[PDB]
Design a protein around this ligand. Structure first.
Ligand code: NAG
Ligand code: NAG
Ligand code: CAC
Ligand code: CAC
Lengths: 344, 344
């Protein structure tokens, strides 16, 4: 059977035979290519899949990239303005799946220029960087990332610029100084400690601090990181912890029976640490959906080249009590942590 | 213990008991009063402090004031000649601490007469005004200002006539026109923009312009003033930026641990601006001395009545990277900016 000619999102999709991909130029909003696949169900009936705009980039986002390029050849002040623009641009919900992938690139350029120019972002710059991130990973865009990641591992890439930005910020803090950044979909703590006199255990997130969003306060997620873990494998440890509310929905998934059903915690430390062989990291993580079963604590390294495969690691962590909408994990090496489970 | 009779600078200082001030008539050069304090060290030994000539005014400077007064009761041409005379007089290094304080008054009379008579100073008049200023604030006179400012806030007063003179000049420029004035100890930019169509961001100082002194070219000080800041709280903005090389040595100091260790940038704008709540002003400032620590960016309002107190403001500005003999600041409201630090 065949999918018939449709008009959708200002584009005509010519009749197509089951199993072939049709391509069209992106809407005049943008440039690139759009695609739609003529699928065949089980009963033998052909039906149109959804159209993909992963390779479409709104002119607005291209213009913002070119300005970014103007500033590079005062650079820092330029990147401050790029992120101001990007956030304003994203808030308008005028972007295709491919504009998200292009935003990750812009954030990398911004983050790489800040490091290259030794330009410490302002306080409002940090908050705005992570508010951009919060927009991008909002569940509202769960289907756009599903479409974006068929062409490029946008989440692997985003977590890596986030890691670079965290340590750009943390590298400017004073010894024993910390900072908290709260957004709709992330909470971030950046902490700096001397390698030879790490002051205390690291816990996170500190709910007592007024400013903490509700979804964290009325929650059970927490990190306990014993100071005994912060040991060397430059003169300061930058410790960053990120609790993503929704990121689990778009990460490389685990083997089929299971699924990322929890909030996600990243714990990055530079320089590299030699963790003890005993699992000494406590990671408690709330669930994204009521009704799960068979929890498996896991860690997943977005730094590896095969990061997009989704090789989750269930031997790093030990799964302990599951209760009150969360599960506790006891993990050995630092990484990105989640509770894999069978969804309803 | 007592300080014994000394003869110094053509004056006899009678024996004095520790802690009392002795007074003498000024040298015959001048009129007024000189003073010297019999101090007591920690060990209990009395010793003469230095003599103060803050209240002495050389006859030469009094004669120049009386001529100033002749011209006022053709006035403008008179004030042109006063500044010609003052500069010639200052260049001769024949002045007491009190002649400096008297020069500030003369510059106010000159500046007030120019405004009162709507007499736009010539190009050579502007340059000569600021060359007078450069002489006066040269570090050579760092001890004279220390002596002058025990009786009158000469620097608060000088910065205010400078502000009045800048806006007298700037009020005569054409729209979008600018001017640069370079001296040994200051660099001044005066810029005029329409309130409703401010053309671009203001940066300063533009080192590319040949004519720029060396101490600025081989330096890192800079202002970035986004056009977004120039918003109203008459039909034109006069924007003046002054980078003082040495002024930090004689401004009201901060709390004891810290000290004005940097070059100083004033940024005046008339009419008054309503700045955004986000800190959008970038101020980079070089250090006056190698060896500082613990930098704190600060702003200080010489317009307030308590200006002489030295209420520096460290919440206006955010201190960012410190590197290559300067420190970057990100400030919210326009003012006079410096980097306070612990000196060696
Ligand atoms: C921006 O980042 C992208 C992706 O990381 C890279 O391909 C591109 O070369 C960068 N552009 C600039 C101007 O640095
Ligand atoms: C000159 O200025 C001084 C100080 O501002 C003031 O006291 C004096 O009255 C002025 N003299 C004239 C003639 O305007
Ligand atoms: C520094 As990491 C979170 O990639 O182990
Ligand atoms: C016009 As101003 C330098 O006193 O803020």
């Amino acid at each position: 059977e065949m999918c018939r000619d449709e008009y959708v999102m200002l584009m005509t999709w010519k009749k197509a035979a089951a199993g072939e991909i049709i391509y069209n130029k992106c809407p005049p909003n943008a440039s690139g290519s759009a695609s739609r696949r003529c699928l065949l169900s089980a009963q033998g009936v052909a039906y149109w899949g959804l159209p993909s705009f992963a390779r479409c980039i709104s002119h607005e986002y291209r213009y913002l990239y070119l300005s970014l390029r103007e500033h590079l050849a005062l650079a820092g002040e330029g990147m401050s303005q790029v992120v101001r623009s990007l956030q304003e641009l994203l808030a308008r919900r005028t972007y295709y799946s491919g504009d998200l992938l292009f935003s990750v690139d812009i954030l990398r350029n911004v983050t790489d220029t800040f490091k290259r120019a030794t330009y410490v972002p302002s306080a409002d710059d940090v908050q705005r960087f992570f508010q951009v991130v919060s927009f991008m990973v909002d569940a509202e865009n769960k289907e756009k990332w599903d479409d974006a990641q068929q062409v490029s591992p946008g989440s692997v890439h985003l977590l890596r610029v986030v890691e670079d930005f965290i340590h750009l910020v943390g590298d400017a803090l004073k010894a024993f100084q910390s900072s908290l950044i709260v957004t709709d979909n992330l909470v971030i703590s950046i902490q700096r400690e001397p390698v030879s006199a790490v002051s205390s255990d690291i816990t996170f997130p500190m709910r007592g601090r007024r400013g903490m969003k509700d979804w964290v306060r009325h929650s059970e997620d927490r990190l306990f990181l014993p100071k005994e873990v912060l040991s060397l494998s430059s003169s300061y440890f930058v410790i960053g912890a990120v609790l993503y509310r929704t990121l689990g929905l778009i990460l490389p998934p685990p083997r089929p029976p299971l699924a990322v059903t929890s909030r996600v915690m990243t714990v990055t430390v530079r320089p590299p640490t030699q963790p003890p062989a005993e699992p000494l990291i406590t990671v408690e993580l709330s669930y994204i959906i009521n009704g799960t079963t068979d929890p498996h604590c896991a860690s997943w390294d977005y730094s590896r080249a095969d990061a997009s495969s989704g090789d989750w690691d269930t031997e790093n962590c030990q799964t302990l009590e599951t209760q009150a909408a969360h599960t506790r994990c006891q993990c050995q090496h630092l990484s990105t942590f989640a509770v894999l489970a069978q969804p309803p």
